[PDB]
């Protein structure tokens, strides 16, 4: 995934549970009929059949909308008899991009219905598009067939055709197809966790029943062949392939998954984060317009840290060039970039600094080593490991009397008046 990228588009309906308030034949078996019209608007002979939820070959559950839209016999969900207020809802186990919807009614399309989304797993909902035979009379909204931008539409509400009639909504409206698809403005429109259809009123086939040997009956019910929800895994443009989301058990389908295989040194379920060691500059979504990747930059830690965090104060201090700060410096290092050895250690020039043994422990003798005020312990020079010795004490470790001194002790070494080479133990010449 070199440049800005995106996973494959697909029907989010597949593999997931579509829910509906009701379905025909909930209790016992039920006779049901369908009525459509021909060119002369005369009612056709109604195909009738039995419905029963307990049996697969008679049931019409909501899941019949999420199945393949091209199988041997067409399948459809069918609500209980005599119901107007109905709701179809699709809950997603993660955040996905929703681009455009296609419903396909077997019965006549509803005289009124609305579509909306939840961006926060069902806590809140916000409209997408209203549908009615008259937007002004039903919802007090303008019709987009005239207003060219309205939120309501009668384009998909005509009783004819009484069967196979489709309802459609496209999130990628003229304003949203241009510009960067990952911008804040577009995410507001595309990103969703749920998708809900609320049917408000049924619609009877207004065809002429002249050729009918019997009056219409057992038809007051909703019916939908397919609930095609085109969309894709959301990854902020830092991925082109997704795996299953943790804890998700799907139900002959081509399922769309949500867990992003993140690229561009990003991380998180949707690449919203930077990789743990790549917080040197602020995260940013890939630019679909520009095609720019906007990939996370690594922190400099000299190989003494595997994690780091951004810092706006350090960021501005560098001149907006770098702001990473290494977390939990390993190998006895200390710096912001783990670039120095801690006190009580020093640079081992024999080794490279990136090496684990870059810093070597100090061997300052506790008694022979002098201590500075406002400190209770001696630490060696980090550059060469030389400890500051008390008077008369010598060496890099201050662990023995200087030449010409004796009586190693907590106050250094006494000068031997030989003078003359000393025996450091007794002071004899
Ligand atoms: C939608 O609005 C109404 C309801 O169907 C209808 O418009 C009526 O008739 C004329 C046509 O423009 C309007 O001036 C009246 O105010 C409406 N009367 C009522 C009682 O609503 C028409 O069916 C539709 N078309 C529109 C409004 O253009
Ligand atoms: C990089 O941009 C500027 C420095 O050139 C940083 O300061 C920002 O300045 C802009 C105006 O140019 C303001 O709108 C921002 O509010 C400033 N940021 C802050 C944190 O005060 C800016 O911070 C840097 N980039 C980022 C992402 O912080
Ligand atoms: C067999 C059956 O479905 N019985 C239901 C019952 O479970 C429910 O509590 C009641 C509420 O109206 O309606 C009836
Ligand atoms: C099934 O019967 C019960 C009454 O005991 C009640 O739920 C209703 O009449 C039937 N169910 C539906 C969904 O209509
Ligand atoms: Ca179907």
Author numbering: 30 to 280, 285 to 462
According to the publication:
Thus, our hypothesis is that Net4 is not a classic ligand activating a membrane receptor with a downstream signalling but rather a regulator of basal membrane maintenance, which indirectly impacts key functions such as axonal growth and angiogenesis.
The LN domain is stabilized by a complex pattern of disulfide bridges composed of 12 cysteine residues. Structural analysis of Net4 and previously published Net1 complex structures reveals incompatibility between the binding residues of Net1 and equivalently positioned residues of Net4.
